[PDB]
Design an enzyme around this catalytic site. Structure first.
Site, short mmCIF file in Angstrom:
data_model
loop_
_atom_site.label_atom_id
_atom_site.label_comp_id
_atom_site.label_asym_id
_atom_site.label_seq_id
_atom_site.Cartn_x
_atom_site.Cartn_y
_atom_site.Cartn_z
N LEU A 14 0.52 -0.92 -0.46
CA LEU A 14 0.03 -0.06 0.53
C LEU A 14 0.98 1.68 -0.03
CD1 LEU A 14 -2.63 -1.15 2.45
CD2 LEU A 14 -2.46 -1.39 -0.06
N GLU A 56 -9.11 0.42 8.63
CA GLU A 56 -9.74 0.10 6.78
C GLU A 56 -9.40 -0.98 6.71
OE1 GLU A 56 -8.59 -0.04 3.69
OE2 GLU A 56 -10.29 0.77 2.94
#
Ligand SMILES: NC(=O)c1ccc[n+]([C@@H]2O[C@H](COP(=O)([O-])OP(=O)(O)OC[C@H]3O[C@@H](n4cnc5c(N)ncnc54)[C@H](OP(=O)(O)O)[C@@H]3O)[C@@H](O)[C@H]2O)c1
Ligand SMILES: CCc1nc(N)nc(N)c1OCCCOc1ccccc1C[C@H](C)C(N)=O
Ligand SMILES: [Cl-]
Length: 186
Positions: A22, A30
Protein backbone atom coordinates in the site's frame (compact mmCIF):
# COMPACT_ATOMS: atom_id res chain seq x y z
CA UNK A 1 -25.27 -15.74 -7.30
CA UNK A 2 -25.42 -12.31 -5.62
CA UNK A 3 -24.33 -8.78 -6.45
CA UNK A 4 -21.22 -7.47 -8.24
CA UNK A 5 -18.99 -5.16 -6.22
CA UNK A 6 -15.58 -3.47 -6.29
CA UNK A 7 -13.76 -2.42 -3.15
CA UNK A 8 -10.68 -0.17 -3.14
CA UNK A 9 -8.78 2.36 -1.06
CA UNK A 10 -7.49 5.36 -3.03
CA UNK A 11 -5.22 8.31 -2.22
CA UNK A 12 -6.08 11.80 -3.44
CA UNK A 13 -3.68 11.39 -6.37
CA UNK A 14 -5.68 8.22 -7.30
CA UNK A 15 -2.97 5.84 -6.03
CA UNK A 16 -3.61 2.31 -4.77
CA UNK A 17 -0.15 0.67 -4.60
CA UNK A 18 3.57 1.23 -4.47
CA UNK A 19 6.37 -1.34 -4.60
CA UNK A 20 3.93 -4.20 -4.16
CA UNK A 21 2.41 -2.75 -0.98
CA UNK A 22 0.00 0.00 0.00
CA UNK A 23 1.23 3.59 -0.57
CA UNK A 24 0.29 4.60 3.00
CA UNK A 25 1.25 2.95 6.31
CA UNK A 26 -1.15 0.31 7.69
CA UNK A 27 -4.61 1.61 8.59
CA UNK A 28 -6.08 -0.96 10.96
CA UNK A 29 -9.74 0.00 10.61
CA UNK A 30 -9.54 0.42 6.83
CA UNK A 31 -8.28 -3.18 6.74
CA UNK A 32 -11.01 -4.34 9.14
CA UNK A 33 -13.55 -2.66 6.82
CA UNK A 34 -12.17 -4.46 3.77
CA UNK A 35 -12.21 -7.78 5.66
CA UNK A 36 -15.76 -7.39 6.98
CA UNK A 37 -17.31 -6.20 3.70
CA UNK A 38 -15.72 -8.90 1.55
CA UNK A 39 -16.28 -11.76 4.03
CA UNK A 40 -19.85 -11.14 5.20
CA UNK A 41 -22.40 -13.19 3.26
CA UNK A 42 -26.13 -12.54 3.63
CA UNK A 43 -26.91 -16.17 2.71
CA UNK A 44 -26.39 -19.16 5.00
CA UNK A 45 -24.18 -21.87 3.54
CA UNK A 46 -22.57 -19.57 0.97
CA UNK A 47 -19.35 -17.60 0.92
CA UNK A 48 -18.45 -14.55 -1.04
CA UNK A 49 -16.00 -14.78 -3.93
CA UNK A 50 -13.03 -12.40 -4.13
CA UNK A 51 -11.46 -11.80 -7.56
CA UNK A 52 -7.97 -10.34 -7.73
CA UNK A 53 -5.09 -9.83 -10.10
CA UNK A 54 -1.86 -11.79 -9.87
CA UNK A 55 0.18 -9.04 -8.20
CA UNK A 56 -2.54 -8.47 -5.61
CA UNK A 57 -2.54 -12.18 -4.72
CA UNK A 58 1.20 -12.13 -4.12
CA UNK A 59 0.94 -8.89 -2.11
CA UNK A 60 -1.01 -10.83 0.54
CA UNK A 61 1.44 -12.36 3.04
CA UNK A 62 1.63 -16.09 2.54
CA UNK A 63 0.19 -16.89 6.00
CA UNK A 64 -3.03 -15.10 4.91
CA UNK A 65 -3.50 -16.78 1.48
CA UNK A 66 -6.04 -17.65 0.56
CA UNK A 67 -8.19 -14.91 2.04
CA UNK A 68 -9.92 -16.70 4.91
CA UNK A 69 -13.68 -17.29 4.79
CA UNK A 70 -13.93 -16.36 1.10
CA UNK A 71 -13.58 -18.22 -2.18
CA UNK A 72 -10.46 -16.87 -3.90
CA UNK A 73 -10.04 -16.44 -7.66
CA UNK A 74 -6.95 -15.01 -9.40
CA UNK A 75 -6.81 -13.38 -12.85
CA UNK A 76 -3.80 -14.09 -15.09
CA UNK A 77 -3.05 -15.11 -18.67
CA UNK A 78 0.50 -16.32 -17.86
CA UNK A 79 -0.15 -18.72 -14.97
CA UNK A 80 -1.19 -22.17 -16.19
CA UNK A 81 -2.70 -23.24 -12.84
CA UNK A 82 -3.96 -21.38 -9.76
CA UNK A 83 -1.04 -20.42 -7.52
CA UNK A 84 -0.44 -22.47 -4.40
CA UNK A 85 -3.22 -21.67 -1.94
CA UNK A 86 -5.73 -20.74 -4.65
CA UNK A 87 -8.12 -23.04 -6.49
CA UNK A 88 -9.53 -20.81 -9.26
CA UNK A 89 -7.72 -18.96 -12.03
CA UNK A 90 -9.37 -17.17 -14.93
CA UNK A 91 -7.98 -15.36 -17.97
CA UNK A 92 -10.30 -12.34 -17.53
CA UNK A 93 -13.04 -10.95 -15.35
CA UNK A 94 -15.46 -11.92 -18.11
CA UNK A 95 -14.33 -15.56 -17.83
CA UNK A 96 -14.40 -15.55 -14.02
CA UNK A 97 -17.96 -14.27 -13.96
CA UNK A 98 -19.00 -16.96 -16.45
CA UNK A 99 -17.28 -19.49 -14.20
CA UNK A 100 -19.68 -18.57 -11.38
CA UNK A 101 -22.51 -20.07 -13.46
CA UNK A 102 -20.99 -23.58 -13.37
CA UNK A 103 -22.06 -26.02 -10.60
CA UNK A 104 -18.73 -25.91 -8.75
CA UNK A 105 -19.43 -22.24 -7.88
CA UNK A 106 -23.09 -21.48 -8.66
CA UNK A 107 -24.42 -22.90 -5.41
CA UNK A 108 -21.50 -21.80 -3.19
CA UNK A 109 -21.14 -18.08 -4.01
CA UNK A 110 -23.17 -15.19 -2.63
CA UNK A 111 -21.64 -11.79 -3.39
CA UNK A 112 -18.73 -11.23 -5.80
CA UNK A 113 -16.05 -8.74 -4.70
CA UNK A 114 -13.33 -7.40 -7.00
CA UNK A 115 -10.39 -6.46 -4.80
CA UNK A 116 -7.78 -5.16 -7.28
CA UNK A 117 -5.66 -4.20 -8.84
CA UNK A 118 -5.83 -1.53 -11.52
CA UNK A 119 -6.77 -3.61 -14.56
CA UNK A 120 -9.26 -5.74 -12.62
CA UNK A 121 -11.08 -2.55 -11.63
CA UNK A 122 -10.91 -1.30 -15.24
CA UNK A 123 -12.54 -4.44 -16.66
CA UNK A 124 -15.28 -4.36 -14.00
CA UNK A 125 -16.17 -0.69 -14.47
CA UNK A 126 -16.64 -1.26 -18.22
CA UNK A 127 -18.67 -4.41 -17.52
CA UNK A 128 -22.35 -3.77 -18.28
CA UNK A 129 -24.93 -4.19 -15.58
CA UNK A 130 -25.50 -3.57 -11.90
CA UNK A 131 -22.21 -2.57 -10.26
CA UNK A 132 -21.30 -1.03 -6.87
CA UNK A 133 -17.97 0.66 -6.06
CA UNK A 134 -16.96 0.75 -2.40
CA UNK A 135 -14.25 3.42 -2.50
CA UNK A 136 -12.26 4.53 0.54
CA UNK A 137 -11.03 8.08 -0.10
CA UNK A 138 -7.71 8.59 1.69
CA UNK A 139 -7.49 12.35 2.12
CA UNK A 140 -3.77 12.77 1.38
CA UNK A 141 -1.37 12.30 -1.51
CA UNK A 142 0.93 9.28 -1.41
CA UNK A 143 3.67 8.32 -3.84
CA UNK A 144 2.28 5.46 -5.94
CA UNK A 145 3.01 3.30 -8.98
CA UNK A 146 -0.50 1.79 -9.39
CA UNK A 147 -3.68 3.82 -9.78
CA UNK A 148 -7.41 3.50 -9.65
CA UNK A 149 -9.28 4.43 -12.84
CA UNK A 150 -11.34 7.58 -12.53
CA UNK A 151 -15.06 7.05 -11.97
CA UNK A 152 -17.35 8.07 -14.84
CA UNK A 153 -19.86 10.23 -12.95
CA UNK A 154 -22.27 10.09 -15.88
CA UNK A 155 -22.71 6.35 -15.22
CA UNK A 156 -22.42 6.20 -11.41
CA UNK A 157 -24.54 7.73 -8.67
CA UNK A 158 -22.84 8.47 -5.36
CA UNK A 159 -25.04 7.18 -2.52
CA UNK A 160 -25.19 9.54 0.49
CA UNK A 161 -25.34 6.60 2.93
CA UNK A 162 -25.05 2.84 2.58
CA UNK A 163 -26.32 0.34 5.21
CA UNK A 164 -23.59 -0.79 7.59
CA UNK A 165 -21.14 1.86 6.29
CA UNK A 166 -20.39 4.93 8.36
CA UNK A 167 -20.32 8.12 6.29
CA UNK A 168 -18.29 10.44 8.55
CA UNK A 169 -14.56 11.16 8.32
CA UNK A 170 -12.32 8.44 9.82
CA UNK A 171 -8.80 9.04 11.17
CA UNK A 172 -5.98 6.77 12.28
CA UNK A 173 -2.20 7.27 12.28
CA UNK A 174 -2.70 10.94 11.33
CA UNK A 175 -4.53 10.10 8.09
CA UNK A 176 -8.15 11.11 7.46
CA UNK A 177 -10.29 9.03 5.13
CA UNK A 178 -13.89 8.44 4.15
CA UNK A 179 -15.96 5.46 2.96
CA UNK A 180 -17.96 6.09 -0.24
CA UNK A 181 -20.34 3.86 -2.24
CA UNK A 182 -21.04 4.46 -5.95
CA UNK A 183 -23.61 2.57 -7.98
CA UNK A 184 -24.59 2.08 -11.62
CA UNK A 185 -26.96 -0.15 -13.54
CA UNK A 186 -26.42 0.13 -17.30
N1 LIG B 1 -5.39 0.17 -2.18
C1 LIG B 1 -6.13 -0.98 -2.60
O1 LIG B 1 -7.30 -1.01 -2.46
C2 LIG B 1 -5.39 -2.10 -3.27
C3 LIG B 1 -6.04 -3.23 -3.71
C4 LIG B 1 -5.34 -4.22 -4.32
C5 LIG B 1 -3.95 -4.09 -4.51
N2 LIG B 1 -3.30 -2.96 -4.08
C6 LIG B 1 -1.88 -2.79 -4.29
O2 LIG B 1 -1.68 -2.57 -5.88
C7 LIG B 1 -0.65 -3.31 -6.27
C8 LIG B 1 -1.10 -4.58 -7.02
O3 LIG B 1 -2.05 -4.16 -7.96
P1 LIG B 1 -1.55 -4.08 -9.55
O4 LIG B 1 -2.50 -3.25 -10.39
O5 LIG B 1 -0.12 -3.60 -9.64
O6 LIG B 1 -1.47 -5.68 -10.11
P2 LIG B 1 -2.74 -6.73 -10.22
O7 LIG B 1 -3.89 -6.06 -10.91
O8 LIG B 1 -3.11 -7.31 -8.92
O9 LIG B 1 -2.00 -7.90 -11.11
C9 LIG B 1 -1.58 -7.56 -12.38
C10 LIG B 1 -1.63 -8.88 -13.16
O10 LIG B 1 -2.72 -9.56 -12.88
C11 LIG B 1 -3.38 -9.97 -14.29
N3 LIG B 1 -4.53 -9.08 -14.48
C12 LIG B 1 -4.84 -7.90 -13.94
N4 LIG B 1 -6.03 -7.53 -14.45
C13 LIG B 1 -6.45 -8.50 -15.28
C14 LIG B 1 -7.60 -8.62 -16.06
N5 LIG B 1 -8.70 -7.67 -16.15
N6 LIG B 1 -7.77 -9.68 -16.83
C15 LIG B 1 -6.82 -10.67 -16.85
N7 LIG B 1 -5.70 -10.56 -16.10
C16 LIG B 1 -5.53 -9.46 -15.31
C17 LIG B 1 -2.42 -9.84 -15.17
O11 LIG B 1 -1.57 -11.02 -14.94
P3 LIG B 1 -0.72 -11.66 -16.18
O12 LIG B 1 0.37 -10.68 -16.63
O13 LIG B 1 -0.09 -12.95 -15.64
O14 LIG B 1 -1.70 -11.94 -17.29
C18 LIG B 1 -1.65 -8.61 -14.68
O15 LIG B 1 -0.35 -8.57 -15.12
C19 LIG B 1 0.07 -3.72 -4.98
O16 LIG B 1 0.93 -2.74 -4.62
C20 LIG B 1 -1.11 -3.81 -3.98
O17 LIG B 1 -0.52 -3.64 -2.63
C21 LIG B 1 -4.01 -1.97 -3.46
C1 LIG C 1 -6.77 -2.79 3.21
C2 LIG C 1 -6.47 -2.46 1.73
C3 LIG C 1 -7.71 -2.41 0.87
N1 LIG C 1 -8.71 -1.60 1.24
C4 LIG C 1 -9.81 -1.54 0.49
N2 LIG C 1 -10.79 -0.71 0.89
N3 LIG C 1 -10.01 -2.25 -0.62
C5 LIG C 1 -9.04 -3.07 -1.00
N4 LIG C 1 -9.23 -3.79 -2.13
C6 LIG C 1 -7.84 -3.17 -0.25
O1 LIG C 1 -6.84 -4.04 -0.66
C7 LIG C 1 -6.96 -5.35 -0.02
C8 LIG C 1 -5.99 -6.26 -0.75
C9 LIG C 1 -5.83 -7.55 0.04
O2 LIG C 1 -4.72 -7.30 0.92
C10 LIG C 1 -4.53 -8.06 2.05
C11 LIG C 1 -5.50 -8.91 2.54
C12 LIG C 1 -5.26 -9.67 3.68
C13 LIG C 1 -4.04 -9.57 4.31
C14 LIG C 1 -3.07 -8.71 3.81
C15 LIG C 1 -3.30 -7.95 2.68
C16 LIG C 1 -2.25 -7.02 2.12
C17 LIG C 1 -2.11 -5.72 2.95
C18 LIG C 1 -3.42 -4.92 3.10
C19 LIG C 1 -1.13 -4.82 2.23
N5 LIG C 1 -0.42 -4.02 3.08
O3 LIG C 1 -0.98 -4.82 1.01
CL1 LIG D 1 -12.68 9.28 -8.94
Amino acid sequence: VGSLNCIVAVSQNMGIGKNGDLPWPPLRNEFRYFQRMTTTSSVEGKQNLVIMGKKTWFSIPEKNRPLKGRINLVLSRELKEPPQGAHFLSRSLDDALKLTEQPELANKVDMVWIVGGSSVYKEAMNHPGHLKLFVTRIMQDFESDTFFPEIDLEKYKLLPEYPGVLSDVQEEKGIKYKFEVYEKND
